[PDB]
Structure 1
Amino acid sequence: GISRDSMHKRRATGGKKKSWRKKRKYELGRQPANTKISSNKTVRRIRVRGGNVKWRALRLDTGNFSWGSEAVTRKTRILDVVYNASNNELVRTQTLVKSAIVQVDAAPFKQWYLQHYGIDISNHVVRKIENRQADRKLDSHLEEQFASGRLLACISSRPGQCGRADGYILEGKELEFYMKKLQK
């Protein structure tokens, strides 16, 4: 099957390598997951070397995404793949791979923001909410996309390896970089 050996490669000088042994099981590869965004979740269990387990996600719809500046992580629905640095064909096929830029539902984070800062984007409770409002700062670029209900996010997990699609909300100069790539 798929093999990760170097025997089929050319030498650094350019000469060929004559085969001196058959393929080994301990140097195999496997078919890519090609995880897609779909509400029909499907993750198949793969037995790997040592009797260990890998989770190969064929279809996913939700992910665990973290708002780094706010230090809050929420499970949210994945809406769309918008950018992929490796292959633009993975964008129109809606493939979920590590480091792909996706849009996630902003609703779970809005609820936390309202519950935490008391703002939309009980005597002892109002005492602390206003206290936390003193040091409240929200990026203009990050707030502008709360109106549409979608947040740009980057997948930080490997769905074909762990079976999950987790990530973090884009912000700072990383958000500026990617939103300029989408400005066409």
Structure 2
Amino acid sequence: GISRDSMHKRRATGGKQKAWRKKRKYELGRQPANTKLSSNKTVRRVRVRGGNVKWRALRLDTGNFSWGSEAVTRKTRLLDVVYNSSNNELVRTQTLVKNAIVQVDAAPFKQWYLTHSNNVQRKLEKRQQGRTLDSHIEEQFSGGRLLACISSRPGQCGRADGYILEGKELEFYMRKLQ
């Protein structure tokens, strides 16, 4: 089947390469899992070299997302794919791969920001002193969604994980999604 050998390639000079060997299993590839964004959740195991196991996520609906400036990580649900820096056709088909741009619920992160009298206040005034809250991340909350970037390998581990966009990286994609 699929192979990762260099034999079928042309030499760097451009000359042909003859085949002195057959294809080996230690050299194989597998065809992708082209992971979907859909509520019919499904991850499927792979038996790989060494008797180890990998996870093909075929359909994924919820993820684990980090808000780094706040150092808060909460599970949320995946709403839709909005930008994919390799191929537009992954956006149209709503495929989850590493470095895809996705909007997420914002519901868990709004409530953590809602949190954080006598004992409780005399910390809530300690906090609320350093609030900055860029108007960009504020406006998204008013819309009910957060731009996020996947940073896991869903076809490799079976999880959609990522981080809320901030600062330059939020600003850059926002100009693109315009």
The interval holding the TM-score normalised by the smaller chain is over 0.9
C-alpha displacement of 1:83: 0.2
> For 1:40 and 1:63, how far apart are their aligned partners in 2?
14
One-letter amino acid of the counterpart of residue 129, structure 1:
L
In structure 1, distance between residues paired with 2:174 and 2:110: 21
2:41 counterpart residue number: 41
Stretches of 4+ aligned residues off by more than 4 angstroms = none
1:16 maps to amino acid: K
Deviations 1:34-92 (A, max 9, x none): 00000010000100000001000000000000000000000000000000000000001
Q: Which amino acid aligns with 1:145?
A: Q
How many angstroms apart in 1 are the aligned matches of 2:153 and 2:64? 13
Q: Specify the code of the residue in structure 1 equivalent to 2:161.
A: D
Deviation at 1:25, TM superposition (A): 0.1
Partner of 2:53: 53
> How many angstroms apart in 1 are the aligned matches of 2:36 and 2:143?
23
CA distance in 2 between counterparts of 1:53 and 1:111 reads 37
What letter is aligned with 2:149? C
Counterpart mapping for 1:88-127 below 5 A: 88-116=88-116, 122-127=117-122
Taking structure 1 as the reference length, what is the TM-score of the superposition?
0.96
Identity of aligned residues (%): 89
SS of 1:30's equivalent in the other structure is coil
Q: CA RMSD in A?
A: 0.5
Distance 2:119 2:107 in 1: 26
Q: Matched residues in 2 for 1:51 and 1:149: separation? A: 44
Q: Counterpart in 2 of 1:144?
A: 139
What's the counterpart of residue 28 of structure 1?
Answer: 28
> What is the alpha-carbon distance in structure 2 between the residues aligned to residue 62 and residue 102 of structure 1?
12
Matched, 1:67 2:67: yes
Residue 102 of structure 2 aligns with an amino acid whose one-letter code is: V
Unaligned runs of 5+ in 1: 117-121
The C-alpha deviation readout for 1:103-138, integer Å capped at 9, x for no partner, is 00000000100011xxxxx42001101111111110
Partner of 2:165: 170
1:99 corresponds to which letter in structure 2?
A: N
AA in 2 matched with 1:182: L
Unmatched 5+ residue regions in structure 2? Answer: none
Give the AA of the match of 2:42.
T
2:76 is the counterpart of 1:81: no
Q: Distance in 2 between matches of 1:5 and 1:44?
A: 26
What is aligned with 2:127? Answer: 132
156, 165, 170: which one aligns with 2:151: 156
